[PDB]
Design a protein around this ligand. Structure first.
Ligand code: ADP
Ligand code: MG
Lengths: 152, 233, 241, 69, 49, 53, 101, 101, 132, 73
């Protein structure tokens, strides 16, 4: 449906599965289903449903062996949601998780984009105690490549 | 309270109560609302025929039943006991007709039905009738509305309500009832008194109403009850 | 209030008959269930049939009785009480036909049985026999008729009813199915009854573990459907459902 | 007030519908309708949810014996 | 159906769940699986008894 | 309507004032009286003064 | 019960505090259970078989509710005749038949 | 009740309208009674009422005065207080009322 | 030296008069009985009245009377001791009366206070002639 | 939980004590073993057999119980 030039109703078709109750073989098929629900909801601009679905995924599962593309896509979706919502420290935290992901941490540009995003979304957040703590942490990351612009 | 003297019907409690007949009257008060109003030129009886489901064919068992061409009867209480009492009332009316070639007066029918209830409330192996009857007749040239209790006591009423919300019904009738009320207005008063204690939507086919004018007692058809409900609302 | 409990004739301080209520509990004691539904021009009773032994003659085991040529009943509850009340119903129908010269109306037979039961509920001579009788017949002026004769003198007429363990579930199912096009045909009524039993019991029926009796306007004689007819109904209606 | 609903969910006639529901009954109705919505996802509370909850609560007072009446 | 309560809280926000329910009755005959019935579900939930 | 007016005037319980105004509106609507626009106006006024316009 | 200070709860102010009450005859829910099962006794016996045709053979006449059935099977099988883990087959059927309840 | 243990036994009948006038005066002494107010009329309006009932009558009339930001009590206030305090919960059911002739 | 010296009236309920819809007359009466005396006593003294301490709220279940009790407890300035009438029927001889005495003594010691007895029908019924 | 001698005043754990059994607990044991029979109890063959199993068999034939997966209550 989504491929056939109509997503408004294709989102509804997919937004009916109770994958948490279905009982898949493991937490892989269900997680893929949930992330695709997320993607369709964001495509149709249904951020309330997107947030509700996000609360249905336990991030602790992403600290596993093959949960790398899943982690990357899930986070990218969270950044999209928070970018619409207007927040910036949550976007920072999501980009920082993306950076911490080893797959992102195995190529020059791949990790450099994540680190620039983390720096910029530290900067864009309002000044609070937590924001200052994150500023200090990113400053002490030591892997900033001393890029003459973001470092300064 | 007097706990020992509440299982038998042939013993006075130390204070003189006959507790079991009062318990029968409690069974009466825990029944479907019914209302009776004695208009100036007739009488009207109403009672909720609300069923416990849509499956109950609400056209087979009636609650407002005739006993003669000029007497009818409704009840509040248990339906089986009501059936027994209506059969006995019909039999008594027929006996009176055979003896005296004249329709039984409403007062006499009430006396005899109360006597039947007394017969049933005077032994240990028999349970008092757990119903209160409202009899409405057009003997002579004036209307009669009577009540008969399990105890065998019978009353003459201007207007009354019995069942679950009889207190509210009687207060409403005190507010609304006036002696010089035509039967057409009394029907509206009866239906309104029912509404004040009728949960759910009072559809034409879940309420039962019977009038008693000089033409004789007659249970209003559901079409007529629908017309009255529409006019009232 | 437990003192007002051992005698059928004692009113509880709030006006309740605990022994009558216990008779109803006795209805819900045979384990079986029964359902009845009336269409435009037919009435159908279907009863769960348990034969938990190879030595028990299934032909003799039954809960559908022919009260008269044109009236049938399904009994649920204690079997001895069921058969006693069936004999009483047959006797009353025979007396009616003898005295008045025409076949007893179904509603009249139900009223007679309900009055007989009310007598026991009022006087203290017997226990109220704990069985529920669902009667079906064809009335010449009204059409198909289904009635109940519970053991307290209550006998309301029904568009569709159930009795036994799962009477509440069957009642809910039939309410839902009758709010939508209560107008049923013969096949549709048999479908509705059998489906109600199957869904409430959570089982699909073999042709033998079910007993169906039917009356129709065209053929107003209580007929107990044979195994072949039951199997035909089950297979055809499950296939075309 | 604390709950939030749609714009076509007027309580303005559920009040008018005759019944003997008490304050506890109304609170139960509201809670049950909210639970219906959350259980069925459908991230709004609507007139159908209130209708079902109202029917459930009002009909809860049943399943008694019918010769008593 | 009691696992919705902890994993998220849409019961707040638009609606109110009066501190959404704290479980179901688990109506059971003399004994079938009551304890283990709850054990397995809570083990899935990762909660503790 | 008079009870709602007095409640609005004196106690500053505009919730109760609105309740009474709605009852008056319903009665005057059933009677189809011309004193129903006033009851509607007063309900809207109570809604405004409740800081929920 | 001769205790009335133990009235209902309602002190709830913490998240993740769900309860599970269990009895027979706020919490507004319920889950009916039946003591037997239509065919689940097969799986009950298979899972309790700590030490399938004979499982079905036991199930034909099986009428039970818990794993005490299979525990009795195993003990009354091993410690009675074989001395006098499979190797039981119809012996478990014999035990379930012996089940008196 | 044997004498020697309880030598004397004093009955306290409800006031006989003169004791009621006395009690009204006693409990209205500390009160701003308007002119033309007839405690004798109130006493007559209170038949078979105890001293507690009379004190409650005074208190409830005072509460009526308090309601209307007043420090003033009038005959209407006492009459309404009498009505509110001597409110009887007579039998509801005419059947139970008419069992006895 | 003397040490500064308890059992109830500490968990101030969160309900408030604004949480209750309608029930205007009952709210007014309960206020006049239990709140006005403790805040505006000059009002009662000026008329020369003893405030009506002690009220009864009778009615069908689930009509917000325990909730009004909790509302007065919330907007209470002194103390609110809550008990249930069925809690006075304990087994051992002469303990229901002992707890009644303890509750009232606790209120007196805790100075201006509001006792609440949720279901008094258990104990406070027509006295009747006992025989056991 | 252990029996240790302790200095009276400082209450410091001095040399430890192995075990203490009350005189009554020592007497709480059969010195002269009773001996009549099993056949000397009639009627309750089922109960005697069940008790013999559930007590003695775990004591002597312990290994077979865990071999077969039996929990000897
Ligand atoms: N007037 C009211 N306004 C709001 N809620 C009410 C009201 N009356 C009752 N309730 C509801 O009923 C519950 C309390 O009922 P309760 O006061 O215990 O009744 P009762 O004490 O008569 O049994 C509360 O949870 C509340 O939500
Ligand atoms: Mg309460």
């Amino acid at each position: 449906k989504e491929q056939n030039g109509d997503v408004k109703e294709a989102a509804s078709i997919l937004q009916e599965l109770q994958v948490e109750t279905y009982g898949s073989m493991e937490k892989k098929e269900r997680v893929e289903f949930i992330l695709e629900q997320m993607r369709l909801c964001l495509a149709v601009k249904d951020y309330i449903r997107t947030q509700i679905i996000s609360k249905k995924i336990n991030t602790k599962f992403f600290q596993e062996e093959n949960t790398e593309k899943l982690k990357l896509k899930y986070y990218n979706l969270m950044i999209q949601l928070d970018q619409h919502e207007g927040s910036y420290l949550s976007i920072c935290k999501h980009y920082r998780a993306i950076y911490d992901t080893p797959c992102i941490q195995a190529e020059s540009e791949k990790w450099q984009q994540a680190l620039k995003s983390v720096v910029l979304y530290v900067i864009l957040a309002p000044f609070d105690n937590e924001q200052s703590d994150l500023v200090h942490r990113i400053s002490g990351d030591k892997k900033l490549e001393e890029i003459p612009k973001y470092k300064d | 309270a007097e706990r020992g003297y509440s299982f038998s019907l042939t013993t006075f409690s130390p204070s003189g109560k006959l507790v079991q007949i009062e318990y029968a009257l409690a069974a009466v008060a825990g029944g479907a609302p019914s209302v009776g109003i004695k208009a100036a030129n007739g009488v009207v009886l109403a009672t909720e025929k609300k069923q416990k489901s849509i499956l109950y064919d609400e056209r087979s068992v009636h609650k407002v039943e005739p006993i003669t061409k000029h007497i009818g009867l409704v009840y509040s209480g248990m339906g089986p006991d009501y059936r027994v009492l209506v059969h006995r009332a019909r039999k008594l009316a027929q006996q009176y007709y055979l003896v005296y070639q004249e329709p039984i007066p409403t007062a006499q029918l009430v006396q005899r039905v109360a006597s039947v209830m007394q017969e049933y409330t005077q032994s240990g192996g028999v349970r008092p009738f757990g119903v209160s009857l409202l009899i409405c007749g057009w003997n002579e040239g004036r209307p009669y509305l009577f009540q008969s209790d399990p105890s065998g006591a019978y009353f003459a009423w201007k207007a009354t309500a019995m069942g679950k919300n009889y207190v509210n019904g009687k207060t409403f009738l005190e507010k609304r009832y006036n002696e010089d009320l035509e039967l057409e207005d009394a029907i509206h008063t009866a239906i309104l008194t029912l509404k004040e204690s009728f949960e759910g939507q009072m559809t034409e086919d879940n309420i039962e109403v019977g009038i008693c004018n000089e033409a004789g007692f007659r249970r209003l058809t559901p079409t007529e009850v629908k017309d009255y409900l529409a006019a009232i609302a | 209030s437990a003192g007002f409990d051992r005698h059928i004739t004692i009113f509880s301080p709030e006006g309740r008959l605990y022994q009558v209520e216990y008779a109803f509990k006795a209805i819900n004691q045979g384990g079986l269930t029964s359902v009845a539904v009336r269409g435009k021009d037919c009435a159908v009773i279907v009863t769960q049939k348990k034969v938990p032994d190879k030595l028990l003659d299934s032909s003799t085991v039954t809960h559908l009785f022919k009260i008269t040529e044109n009236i049938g009943c399904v009994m649920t509850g204690m079997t001895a009480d069921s058969r006693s009340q069936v004999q009483r119903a047959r006797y009353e129908a025979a007396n009616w036909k003898y005295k008045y010269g025409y076949e007893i109306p179904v509603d009249m037979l139900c009223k007679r049985i309900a009055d007989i039961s009310q007598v026991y509920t009022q006087n203290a001579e017997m226990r109220p026999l704990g069985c529920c009788m669902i009667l079906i017949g064809i009335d010449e002026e009204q059409g198909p008729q289904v009635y109940k004769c519970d053991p307290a003198g209550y006998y309301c007429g029904f568009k569709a009813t159930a009795a036994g363990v799962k009477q509440t579930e069957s009642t809910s199912f039939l309410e839902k199915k009758v709010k939508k096009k209560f107008d049923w045909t013969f096949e549709q009524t048999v479908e509705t009854a059998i489906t109600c039993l199957s869904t409430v019991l959570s089982i699909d029926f073999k042709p033998s573990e079910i007993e169906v009796g039917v009356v129709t306007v065209e053929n107003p004689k209580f007929r107990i459907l044979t195994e072949a007819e039951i199997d035909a109904h089950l297979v055809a209606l499950a296939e075309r459902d | 007030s604390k709950m939030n609903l749609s714009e076509e969910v007027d309580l303005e006639d559920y009040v008018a519908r005759p019944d003997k529901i008490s304050g506890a009954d109304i609170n139960s109705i509201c809670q049950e309708s909210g639970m219906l919505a959350v259980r069925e996802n459908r991230y709004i509370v609507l007139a159908k949810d209130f209708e079902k909850a109202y029917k459930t609560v009002i009909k809860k007072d049943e399943q008694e014996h019918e010769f008593y009446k | 159906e009691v696992i919705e309560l902890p994993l998220t809280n849409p019961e707040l926000f638009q609606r109110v769940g009066i501190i959404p329910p704290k479980g179901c009755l688990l109506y059971g005959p003399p004994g079938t699986g009551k304890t283990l019935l709850a054990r397995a579900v809570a083990s899935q939930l990762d909660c503790n008894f | 309507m008079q009870s709602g007016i007095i409640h609005a005037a004196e106690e500053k319980d505009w919730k109760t004032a609105y309740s009474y105004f709605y009852e008056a509106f319903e009665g005057y609507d059933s009677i189809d009286s011309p004193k129903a626009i006033t009851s509607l106006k007063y309900m809207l006024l109570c809604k405004i003064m409740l800081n929920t316009p | 019960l001769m205790e009335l200070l133990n009235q209902m709860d309602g002190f709830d102010t913490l998240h993740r505090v769900k309860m599970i009450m269990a009895t027979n005859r706020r919490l507004d829910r319920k889950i009916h259970i039946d003591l037997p099962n239509e065919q689940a006794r097969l799986d009950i016996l298979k899972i309790h078989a700590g030490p399938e045709i004979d499982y079905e053979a036991i199930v034909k006449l099986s009428d039970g509710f818990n794993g005490a059935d299979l525990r009795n099977v195993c003990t009354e099988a091993g410690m009675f005749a074989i001395r006098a883990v499979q190797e039981d087959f119809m012996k478990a059927v014999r035990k379930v038949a012996d089940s008196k309840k | 009740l044997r004498p020697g243990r309880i030598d004397r036994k004093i009955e306290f009948p409800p006031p006989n309208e003169e004791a009621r006038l006395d009690i009204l005066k006693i409990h209205s002494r500390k009160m701003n009674l308007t002119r033309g107010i007839n405690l004798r009329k109130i006493a007559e309006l209170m038949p078979g009422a105890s001293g507690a009932e009379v004190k409650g009558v005074c208190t409830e009339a005072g509460m009526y005065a308090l309601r209307e930001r007043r420090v003033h009590v009038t005959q209407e206030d006492f009459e309404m207080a009498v009505a509110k305090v001597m409110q009887k919960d007579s039998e509801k059911n005419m059947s139970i009322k008419k069992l006895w002739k | 030296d003397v040490l500064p010296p308890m059992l109830t009236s500490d968990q101030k309920p969160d309900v408030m008069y604004a949480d209750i819809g309608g029930m205007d007359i009952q709210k007014q009466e309960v206020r006049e009985a239990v709140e006005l005396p403790l805040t505006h006593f000059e009002l009662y003294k000026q008329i020369g009245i003893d405030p009506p301490r002690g009220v009864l709220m009778y009615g069908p279940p689930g009509c917000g009377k325990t909730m009004l009790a909790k509302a007065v407890a919330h907007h209470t300035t002194a103390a609110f001791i809550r008990v249930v009438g069925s809690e006075f029927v304990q087994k051992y001889l002469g303990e229901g009366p002992r707890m009644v005495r303890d509750v009232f003594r606790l209120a007196k010691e805790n100075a201006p206070a509001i006792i609440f007895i949720d279901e008094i029908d258990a104990i406070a019924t027509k006295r009747f002639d006992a025989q056991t | 939980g252990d029996l240790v001698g302790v200095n009276k005043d400082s209450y410091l754990i001095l040399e430890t004590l192995p075990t203490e059994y009350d005189s009554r607990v020592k007497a709480m044991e059969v010195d002269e073993r009773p001996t009549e029979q099993y056949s000397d109890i009639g009627g309750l063959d089922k109960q005697i057999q069940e008790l013999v199993e559930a007590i003695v068999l775990p004591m002597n034939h312990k290994e077979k119980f865990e071999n077969l997966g039996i929990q000897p209550p």
